[PDB]
Amino acid sequence: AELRSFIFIDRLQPQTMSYLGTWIKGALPRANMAAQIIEVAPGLDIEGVTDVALKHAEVKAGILVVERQFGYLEFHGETGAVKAAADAALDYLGGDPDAAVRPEILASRIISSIDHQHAFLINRNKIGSMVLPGESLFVLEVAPASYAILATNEAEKAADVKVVDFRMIGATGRVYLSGTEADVRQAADAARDALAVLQGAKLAAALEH
């Protein structure tokens, strides 16, 4: 009924991958691997997607989740295999990647010089890297939620920031990044730019004529 995301991660970054590895129930990715993430509604449709994907290439599935509303599949491996499995999944889902719901940024803020108590509270909630008092913190909320992994991975590509937390499953996705102010602003720019590439996908046709 709804393709909420169809996300190719060309190369997973270390902190992003390490954070995934903290909670995902499936196969744990090797360094620098490509990955595909698919989110659908209704959630249970993802079971059929997973069946098709796994049986079309040698990919390792790290995520299979049917939450309250939506279903999620992630798989990774050699780039060739990931693309092949993704393409099979896509054909199963209508064959058009631009049918996917565009990401929306619901909230984004850079908090400069995080307060001591505030860092303590965040570090109690988060399962990734530690935020320090005085650091800057970037927070981003996106829907569909799965797009949080794209925002996070692209942020890490562009800046030496810490992945404090990111959630890519639910009604909305969340991204928490910390570091020096310049690094955090740079990382925030890259995360927003990554979503903008998707938001402006149909611009491609305008440029091809």
Added chain:
Amino acid sequence: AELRSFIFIDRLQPQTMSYLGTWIKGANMAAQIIEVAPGLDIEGVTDVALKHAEVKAGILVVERQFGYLEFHGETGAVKAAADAALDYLGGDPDAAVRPEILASRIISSIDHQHAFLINRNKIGSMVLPGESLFVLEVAPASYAILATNEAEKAADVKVVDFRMIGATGRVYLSGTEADVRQAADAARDALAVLQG
């Protein structure tokens, strides 16, 4: 306020009733499932049901949005408590939201990775690589119990996973492909009988 389900089950099956915290002895156990919004309204329903007749409640839950009551026992007792609940809920069963099958699929011979992933999410019997799988999603969620009970009647399948509480309900059944096909048709027809 809305009545999301008013489900009567004539004959509970072993795997299905296991989720309700009961089992069949030796020597017919009926059950009634009720789902409502707003969720806390189920407390008034429970108060009326459990008082009017003596039955055994396996479920009393208020989740994010919806409220759930299930009780079971001998047919007379169950139907007695159910009618008292119904009168409290307006006295008309047709007011209940009709079930909608959101997704349903037969997956022949599941991959070893797929089995692995399901087993790490499931509440039910371990699924093995190569087994055939039937998956089914329904809203309202509580209708999952009716589809699972009817499926269990019709075929020798194992209940791999089962959720009847939430925005949607879910059923994972495994077995040979022949049994799964039977289970699937029965589950689907069960959700079509309550439509008619």
Added chain:
Amino acid sequence: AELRSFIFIDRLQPQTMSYLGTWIKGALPRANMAAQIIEVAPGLDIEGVTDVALKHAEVKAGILVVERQFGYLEFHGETGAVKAAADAALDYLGGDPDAAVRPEILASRIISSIDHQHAFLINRNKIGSMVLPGESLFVLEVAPASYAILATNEAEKAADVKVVDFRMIGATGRVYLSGTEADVRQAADAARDALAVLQGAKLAAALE
């Protein structure tokens, strides 16, 4: 965005605070502190709120939570500090406390004499005190969910009841209170009236 609640608790009550302390991960309040509760959508907006509130006065945050949809901040301390932090948070959120979504009661009911099996069933889900067979039970569902803490705290002020359950985070908030029928009806009346004064916030302008 959306300011879902902006709630000031003048004096946190024992059970309310004890129940709160049961699950919260932030700092724990001592006897009869004041508290402020703020709920927003989108949830992640609460982080900026927290930054402002905690920088402007010496308060202790008990709750910093972003759930499925909404975000929650609770903090407490001496009265002056809580109000200072609260007004700072308020200025950040627009300056108008009446921009907050007014509480709606979705369900409320007193069960006069709870069945023994019913009492058992409730006790499996609840984290507060147990409801006992024969006792009266008040149940209340409110949206936005955070208003549950105000209903509960005010209930405890007005009557000697047991806080059986109290949920203030989610799509809807829930309150379960038990005890003698007299006490429970008294608590129920105070819980609803507390929500009523907020619902009638704009009557103030009419009266002055």
Added chain:
Amino acid sequence: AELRSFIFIDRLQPQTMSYLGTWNMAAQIIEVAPGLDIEGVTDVALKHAEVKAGILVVERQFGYLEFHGETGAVKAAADAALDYLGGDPDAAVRPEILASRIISSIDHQHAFLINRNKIGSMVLPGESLFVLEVAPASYAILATNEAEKAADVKVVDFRMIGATGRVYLSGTEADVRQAADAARDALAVLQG
């Protein structure tokens, strides 16, 4: 093998019963070592059936079986288990009270720390508290049940599975003291 416990509760009290819900009938509780021996016990006890087993656990070391329902059927199942074990209900390890204390008027901090640790009713700042630790653990149900039966107290916390069992009771100091006496005397055994 080792019979650690063979306890009959004539009439379960509501708070004791309700606490078990997170898992006025008679009950039987049987603890054994090694733990997996409880499966043979359960197969013998429950083949009779007629009772409803609320607990079947094999923890780190010890095995637990609890079944309740109406009295006669419980005892019949209990006797069936008994014959299977050693066939005499006094080879069971008698309880040892490792620690027991009445704590007058709990501090507000103390209350909160207890409340986030425990399942069961809420202890409130100012209330008095009775605490008791016994081994074998399962005897905690006996002390707890007889305490609630004898006094007007809240079962704050209660654990009957593990190396040692625990009871937390709160209320007025007067009520807590009566519970304490009953809890301690319930664990009193004749031995000579």
Added chain:
Amino acid sequence: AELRSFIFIDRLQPQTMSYLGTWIKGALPRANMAAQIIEVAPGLDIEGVTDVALKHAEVKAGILVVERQFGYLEFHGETGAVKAAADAALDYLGGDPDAAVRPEILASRIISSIDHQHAFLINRNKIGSMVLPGESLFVLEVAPASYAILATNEAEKAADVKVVDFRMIGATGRVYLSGTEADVRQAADAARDALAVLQGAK
């Protein structure tokens, strides 16, 4: 300090494999991969073992656990890679692959025809294959706990039994097998013999 077990499994059986996949936090082993299991005390020693093991060969770790007292490592791979990793780890543990603590059967029973409620109770406790009323049930408790993996796997090799439940981490290990009564006893005595050949010393 003590080596509590040093177990090589040539091929993991389907149900044993599927059951591991239900709880282990590492990589799932594929059908008929070799696997090595190492249990040690003190528990934290297993971190050093793990470091040496993963760095000497290309293996996949399925289990890394430091429980109340003991530490556990499991890794699987091609037989060659596994053996190389295990020999490295063994050398790191001094050597002598037989200095390991010998299995001790604390309890062993065939329940011939399990009754209804007992089945219901077991079914709500276990996370493996479901036991049916009337089936036979083999229960086996062993110390050190990690020997349960060897008993279970070998029992599944011997007869068509269902792996209801098995636990290989803790003070003691447990094995629950079900099926027809004939197959349960072959499985049981294969489980015992798998442990017995390790028990005995000359």
Added chain:
Amino acid sequence: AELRSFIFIDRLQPQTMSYLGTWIKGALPRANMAAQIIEVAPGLDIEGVTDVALKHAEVKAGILVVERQFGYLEFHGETGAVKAAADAALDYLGGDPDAAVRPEILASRIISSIDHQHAFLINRNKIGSMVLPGESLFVLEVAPASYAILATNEAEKAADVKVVDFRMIGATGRVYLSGTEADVRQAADAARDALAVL
């Protein structure tokens, strides 16, 4: 029947503090906090200990648990208040601070460069900061368990390491520290010498 530990911490460090539910109040060593940790057997004896301590001084109790066999209390605050509460606690137990069981280091190791999947496995086990592949690691196991907080606090004040995992409750305590090789080696020496002073 047994005093397993009676630990005084002169000044708590931020990461160690977080496990006690507190933090450094602003950027000032003014509000530096001492803490006292007490572990006993039988576990339930800690409830009487807590009652005595909390009522003799203005301290903040951050830990109160009775596990399988042992009981744990921790409270922090100003140095004078902490010592006052501790002394009353000590008086209640027997008045002998040196009667506490001596800490034993069951295992300790520096792992120079964590393998990729090793970091995965640790991260899925830990309570603390995320460890990354390539980072160095110091692991330490100690009995009684509560002594882990002393080794961890001392390590933290001596080096720029991340507390990846920390357990101070159970049969044995555990601490995982990560960082550069230099930082981890300094933290190791400090943690070991902290348990050696005793």
